[PDB]
Amino acid sequence: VVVTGYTTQRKADLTGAVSVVKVDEIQKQGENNPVKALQGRVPGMNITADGNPSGSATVRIRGIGTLNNNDPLYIIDGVPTKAGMHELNGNDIESIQVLKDAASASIYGSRAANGVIIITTKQGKKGQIKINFDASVSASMYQSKMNVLNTEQYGRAMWQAYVNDGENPNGNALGYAYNWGYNADGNPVLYGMTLSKYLDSKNTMPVADTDWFDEITRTGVIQQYNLSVSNGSEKGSSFFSLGYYKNLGVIKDTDFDRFSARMNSDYKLIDDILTIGQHFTLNRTSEVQAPGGIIETALDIPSAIPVYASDGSWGGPVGGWPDRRNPRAVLEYNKDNRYTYWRMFGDAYVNLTPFKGFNLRSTFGLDYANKQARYFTYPYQEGTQTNNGKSAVEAKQEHWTKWMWNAIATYQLEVGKHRGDVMIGMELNREDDSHFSGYKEDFSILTPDYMWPDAGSGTAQAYGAGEGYSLVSFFGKMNYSYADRYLLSLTLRRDGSSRFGKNHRYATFPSVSLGWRITQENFMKELTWLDDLKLRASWGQTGNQEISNLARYTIYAPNYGTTDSFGGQSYGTAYDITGSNGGGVLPSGFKRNQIGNDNIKWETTTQTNVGIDFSLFKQSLYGSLEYYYKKATDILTEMAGVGVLGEGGSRWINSGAMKNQGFEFNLGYRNKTAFGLTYDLNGNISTYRNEILELPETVAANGKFGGNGVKSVVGHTYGAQVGYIADGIFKSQDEVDNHATQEGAAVGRIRYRDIDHNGVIDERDQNWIYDPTPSFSYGLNIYLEYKNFDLTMFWQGVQGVDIISDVKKKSDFWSASNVGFLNKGTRLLNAWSPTNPNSDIPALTRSDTNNEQRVSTYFVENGSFLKLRNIQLGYTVPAVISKKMRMDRLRFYCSAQNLLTIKSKNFTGEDPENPNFSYPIPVNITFGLNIGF
Amino acid sequence: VVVTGYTTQRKADLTGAVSVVKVDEIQKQGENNPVKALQGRVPGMNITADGNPSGSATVRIRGIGTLNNNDPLYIIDGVPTKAGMHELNGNDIESIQVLKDAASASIYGSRAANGVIIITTKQGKKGQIKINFDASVSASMYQSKMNVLNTEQYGRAMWQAYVNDGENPNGNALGYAYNWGYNADGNPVLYGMTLSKYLDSKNTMPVADTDWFDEITRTGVIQQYNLSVSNGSEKGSSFFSLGYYKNLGVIKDTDFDRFSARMNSDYKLIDDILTIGQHFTLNRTSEVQAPGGIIETALDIPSAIPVYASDGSWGGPVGGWPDRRNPRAVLEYNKDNRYTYWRMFGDAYVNLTPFKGFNLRSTFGLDYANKQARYFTYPYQEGTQTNNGKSAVEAKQEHWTKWMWNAIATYQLEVGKHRGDVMIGMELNREDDSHFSGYKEDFSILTPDYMWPDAGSGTAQAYGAGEGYSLVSFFGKMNYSYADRYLLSLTLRRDGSSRFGKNHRYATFPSVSLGWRITQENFMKELTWLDDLKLRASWGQTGNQEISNLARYTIYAPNYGTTDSFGGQSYGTAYDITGSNGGGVLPSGFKRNQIGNDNIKWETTTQTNVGIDFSLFKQSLYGSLEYYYKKATDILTEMAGVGVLGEGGSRWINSGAMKNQGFEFNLGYRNKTAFGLTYDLNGNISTYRNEILELPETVAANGKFGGNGVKSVVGHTYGAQVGYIADGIFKSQDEVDNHATQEGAAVGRIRYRDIDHNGVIDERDQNWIYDPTPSFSYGLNIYLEYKNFDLTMFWQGVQGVDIISDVKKKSDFWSASNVGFLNKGTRLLNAWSPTNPNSDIPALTRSDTNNEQRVSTYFVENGSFLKLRNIQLGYTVPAVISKKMRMDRLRFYCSAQNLLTIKSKNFTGEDPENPNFSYPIPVNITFGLNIGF
Helix, strand or coil, X not given: CEEECCEEECXXXXXXXXXXXXXXXXXXXXXXXXXXXXXXXXXXXXXXXXXXXXXXXXXXXXXXXXXXXXXXXXXXXXXXXXXXXXXCCCCCCCEEEEECCCCCCCCCCCCCCCCXXXXXXXXXXXXXXXXXXXXXXXXXXXXXXXXXXCHHHHHHHHHHHHHHHCCCCCCCCCCEEEEEEECCCCCEEEEEEEXXXXXXXXXXXXXXXXXXXXXXXXXXXXXXXXXXXXXXXXXXXXXXXXXXXXXXXXXXXXXXXXXXXEEEEXXXXXXXXXXXXXXXXXXXXXXXXXXXXXXXXXXXXXXXXXXXXXXXXXXXXXXXXXCCXXXXXXXXXXXXXXXXXXXXXXXXXXXXXXXXXXXXXCEECCEEEEEECCEEXXXXXXXXXXXXXXXXXXXXXXXXXXXXXXXXXXXXXXXXXXXXXXXXXXXXXXXXXXXXXXXXXXXXXXXXXXXXCCCCCCCCECCEEECCEEEEEEEEECCECCCCCEEEEEEEEEEEECCCCCCCCXXXXXXXXXXXXXXXXXXXXXXXXXXXXXXEEEEEEEXXXXXXXXXXXXXXXXXXXXXXXXXXXXXXXXCCCCCCCCCXXXXXXXXXXXXXXXXXXXXXXXXEEEEEEEXXXXXXXXXXXXXXXXXXXXXXXXXXXXXXXXXXXXXXXXXXXEEEEXXXXXXXXXXXXXXXXXXXXXXXXXXXXXXXXXXXXXXXXXXXXXXXXXXXXXXXXXXXXXXXXXXXXXXXXXXXXXXXXXXXXXXXXXXXXXXXXCCCCCCCCCEEEECCCCCXXXXXXXXXXXXXXXXXXXXXXXXXXXXXXXXXXXXXXXXXXXXXXXXXXXXXXXXXXXXXXXXXXXXXXXXXXXXXXXXXXXXXXECCEEECCEEEEECECCHHHHHCCCCCECECCEEEECCCEEECCCCCCCCCCCCCCXXXXXXXXXXXXXXXX | CXXXXXXXXXXXXXXXXXXXXXXXXXXXXXXXXXXXXXXXXXXXXXXXXXXXXXXXXXXXXXXXXXXXXXXXXXXXXXXXXXXXCCCCCCCCXXXXXXXXXXXXXXXXXXXXXXXXXXXXXXXXCCCCCCEEEEEEEEEEECCXXXXXXXXXXXXXXXXXXXXXXXXXXXXXXXXXXEEEEECCCCCEEEEEEEECCECCCCCCCECCXXXXXXXXXXXXXXXXXXXXXXXXXXXXXXXXXXXXXXXXXXXXXXXXXXXXXXXXXXEECCCCCCEEEEEEEEEEEXXXXXXXXXXXXXXXXXXXXXXXXXXXXXXXXXXXXXXXCCHHHHHHHCCCCECEEEEECCCCCEEECCCCCEEECCEECCEEEEEECCEEECCCEECCEECCCCCEEECCEEEEEEXXXXXXXXXXXXXXXXEEEEEEEEEEEEECCEEECCEEECCCXXXXXXXXXXXXCCCCECCEEECCEEEEEEEEECCXXXXXXXXXXXXXXXXXXXXXXXXXXXXXXXXXXXXXXXXXXXXXXXCCCEEECEEEEEXXXXXXCCCCCCCCCCCEECCCCCCCCCCCCCCCCCCCCCCCCCCCCCCCCCEECCCCCCCCCCEEEEEEEEEEEEEECCCEEEEEEEEEEEEECECEEEXXXXXXXXXXXXXXXXXXXXXXXEEEEEEEEEEXXXXXXXXXXXXXXXXXXXXXXXCCCCHHHHCCCCCCCCCCCECECCCCEEEECECCCCCCCCHHHHCCCCCCCCCCCCCECCCCCCCCCCCCCCEEEEXXXXXXXXXXXXXXXXXXXEEEEEEEEEXXXXXXXXXXHHHHCCCCCCCCCCCCECCHHHCCCCCCCCCCCCCCCCCCCCCCCCCEHHHCEECCEEECCEEEEECECCHHHHHCCCCCECECXXXXXXXXXXXXXXXXXXXXXXXXXXXXXXXXXXXXXXXXC
């Protein structure tokens, strides 16, 4: 029996694509977020994340659905919230339904276009008093370090670039000395290379060989605790959890810690005609955030810079070396930007049955959450890197508030061989967000406790805003079986929000879903090895409303001009009249911000579905097979006002359409063998294919969504880039005339193929080179049970992925970024030379002669992989030794996450998931236990 | 069985002055605050309050104890908090112990010098599933309106003042016309009086007769709701409350509303060797606050001013009339200064008994509370009253956080005829307060939703601070009986806070308490009508530590000078060097704020006690009789630095002593009579007497505490004022030489008696005229029980009180305040005249010729009273009609608060509790019900 919306149906009576998740593995993955702890157990649901200690996750359901925001809608004990789950207690979990469909998720709202994830929490069982106590102590180790070139290879690369120019390499701005000459074969050979002693003339900074990715990185411990007490009688139940989870990241001076609590209960009074219950949660998270671009800064700075000066201050690029801040200083100054986040839930449902089989309900949600921060800035001095002696402190504060109310009323009848369930009810909502801030300047002492905004001297500012939302709706549902053969369900939800235009308030969303069994038909009784086979099909129509709050309002704004605008644009409304030329007493006025239409509308999607169930071989080989085809029809794109409309012409209109189709196929084989062993192998294989149907205007031309301003996106998939084709190097001398009219043609300088074959090195040779929607995404869970032992493994992967690497631009070209003399990655030290003609890496030039920074097939890798997510070995302590200590179950398990990975030949990198500069993925090793009374 | 600290003892085994309160009347008083709902049920505990809708209360226990802050310490389910209880749910109350003693409250802390109020909450009983549902709908009516004089009496008073001058009354600045003449007996008689049509020459404001106390006052409704569900089995218990309480004050545009919740539970696992439980609360209050001086402003403004102008704007004193703002405008602009206050509690106690009779415990408190506000200011224009066109908005935010941890370990043995209970344990605490703010200026549109700090143009500021606290202690307790005759208990608590000086961290607090029975001695068995008589005596030593947080630190502060200081004092640290004379780049420095000693110390009190119990007449006539004598010895007084110490000489030292002594006597007679009736009459009579033992320095001279700078306070009581003696009027002509050398001597001008009898109208004739510590404070509760009916009454009063009235200065003198032509109270219209020589009210002069604003016996009234606090009549619905509806108990009661009052002859006022300008006390009338399932 599972929960789908507000009701509970049977397990074998579903009609939509309700994918129920086994929650026996969520505590075995060992993470903060449960959604990150899925990461492949379900099909058609791409979850991508980092090794951020908060464990936040980017979730897509059934592939990409809409151009703008498409986060799914979580539901935690009736009350919904679209934001969180890395701060919620991820261990009071009873079942996680995932409603991937639209004809089964149409009941829950208009805002269920991206699919809803129904979560429920634990409860008290009848006649049990059990109490558990979990723990874990882990360790995080770094594995995916990109290799960079140190001081000798840096000097060799600089010498190679200057002799490929032909300029004397000894006339460089850096402190290098080169002893070199000419070989008899014409190629220059570097004989001797010698550094200086200091970095400048004034002898402030010595030279060294600093390992930056070994300087900002530590091993980080990870702790965890838990406790859970239950209860339960024939008239009441209770539950009461606790928690703690402390994570210290692999990058230095970032962390996360979460405290938690939970109280659940219910009380049934008069023969089950009156039932009051509640659900409550209370968290506190406290995360120090990593700064922006700290991996890229750790790649950029040359290794000759020391981490300290002659005195205790930080070292820096004192002259000639490019302007990159010391990353150890960036992590040492972003140490006490700690925020603090409280959060509460609520529920109070009241049940009432007047005669029999006919219930009523009236809940009341609540969702409060505030967030206090205090962000410091400091004065620094590293050679030429100086913030000019500036001190400030910003003291933010944000607030959120939601509350719902709904009153369903269900009916239940069983006569003959027919059962049915009709329910009706309304719903309410209200969101009241806020924030404000402060600012001060020019402090005297520099510590995180002196720098409160009263101990300052300088100028001050203040900020703040406020938002809102409302909703009111009515719904309905039906069920039918008529023989325990032919299932049928119809829903309908009329709903009207507070962001829809003035022309139409209420929106209607119908749904039809039907399914019928096979093995209960009497003409199939000759097939005895089969056990159950269920057909299903459905057709729904949902559509979200995550449009901006000011889409229908024609905003006017004061804009006196106190805020800063560089360039003198400064769209102000002051205008000193009387010719005073002085004094801050100027009059004010209103400029127009944007212009709204009154005919705004939700983003409706019409999604069909066809599914097939099976079960064989005395309840084994279970699994499904589904097919789906969705089509959103009204996507919002804000368009700039043409010409004579002047300022404030950005009108939000809704036109655009996408369509998605694919397959899902899960399977599971559980069977005990004669060896004295029991195995279980669940697994799933998905398939995904996207298309943009039509895009309205020149927004399709400039390429906000797809091709980079040179090709239309309509017809192809979403996010597909369009660029050149690079097929090799100018290896021979006769490539300068074997090729056709190349602009930059040298002994390096990768060739671009002709498409028009007319000497075309114009911008008319680009084609679609990169589409990020892979086929053949799959996963596999493997479970073993020997005597007194248990082993759990996992595998997850995807085949046929294209990625756009930007560490390849940093590691294959000497001059591709803007600033010069940056550190690189040590793949380019084996570049093309007259001595070594056996490498595909181009030559090392000092200037971008041939335009090599264009988008091209040289920057497309094979992103297919297969990596083990976790493996966990346990050891259950046997019966009489545990029962001598008056306890039920004991366990001493061990596990490790992300232990290995295998990739293709076609990838010169370090991590096939995130090739770019994000937070890395570290290896965990866990040594925990599980005391169960 | 009651809770005293961390343990539970028997009801008849107490030794200190533990006054247990019957909580069956807290829900019958019908208020928000429970402490305000005591107000006289206990002796030796003065509670004073107003009709503020929040219902906050000023509480003193055993009279005044210390010169600075002396609020008591509340304890709600183990975790303490010194602030609140008008925001807590005042209906989940199980028992309220009040530990008035020091040898019984010495266990709970050093900070129990002012007595502790132990509160506990409800729980689940064994084998019950009950559920209650309370309600109320009330009405608040105004009764205590001070009488003011309207336009004709105002003109008559002005004419009488001008003819007592002798100046022509028609040459006044206001629009009045007087037709008058001289009678043959010399006295001037006013024949005709005529007003104008408008108030100014430009005809902007008409004239009228506006009733100000009828303009800012409305009848205000009061709502209330509740719900409570319990549970309980042999292994677990639960409880779950709700709540709502909405109050709309009698003064217009002030209100209060509180939402609430509560969850309590506990679970005992293995034969009572493991027990986990919790207590949680969650509130939300939202109060719009009344402004400062709105009763005084409603008294001050003359009644000729209209509430509106010729157009829709507010009227005002356009010329000649004194500068007082329109009070209806003050209430209309302070309409949306609403704040919002969330609050949580917490507890998680873990019990464990290793073998038998020997428990352990480990709790963990939590107390979070934030408070968000947004205070507006507006531009106004009423004649000459104008805020110069200024708009601003301040967006405050405050935060609090406490958490405790303690681990007691008790033992229990019973051998022979001896029992004992020894327990030891430690304790921890930490307070982390905060706040910050913002500010903006010069807004365009004037509404409470446009005025967020981003839609402004003007200057901005920011504020903020942060505080702290810590504590760690160790304690102990003992018990003994040896025969069930001779009781004895010894405690000791070693404690050291984080505000004590560097010379000594930890403080020790001993206690001895003993008591012994009478009726268990065999030589008293001949007295058979007596039932129980218990002696008790105790000697303790406690002392609080509510000293300032910076009492030992020698504060230095930057003070650049950005803040404002009028007069040019401006103790800044800028000092432009290089002679620039311009540019805001000036250097900065540190000035000294104050200077701290390292030998600071807590404010210790040594309090003894002697008590007598009795019980008679087959368990009736119960009551006690106590006597007490406390003596605090180290009171903190900050003293200014003498002379050459210069700036920052305010050192906190501790020297000073007070002593208090008095009686308490409670009684109760419960007896069913033969009439078919049952009565119950509890009652109590207290007695109080204070003295200041010694005060160190010139702080006793200038009169911060007692006499107004002319007499020392040492020897007398606290707060006693010293002034002249006024004994009558100069009724006859020969009083100018019957009296002795009066400065201002006229036909009015009250005489002051000579003390030195040397023609002394010097400052050497003042004596102690006013001491605010009354004798004979008492109360009485009366309960009636007829068949199928119940009546509850109450009476509370105090005899022999002196007060200092300042409405008497406004209602007896024409010119006593600073500004002229103010409205007054209509007692002075029957003042002394040659026509009426039969009044004690002095003559109406225009100028203060004789200094009548001195402190004198003319401004001392008899503040004794006796008023009915509440009376409540109920009607229980009988058995079979209630039991037909499947419910237990039904009730339809009615009640009214503050219905009447009786006072002495010696008081010409309206309310003997608060004669000054505070929030008034309105009459409630309640028509509620009580459904009990």
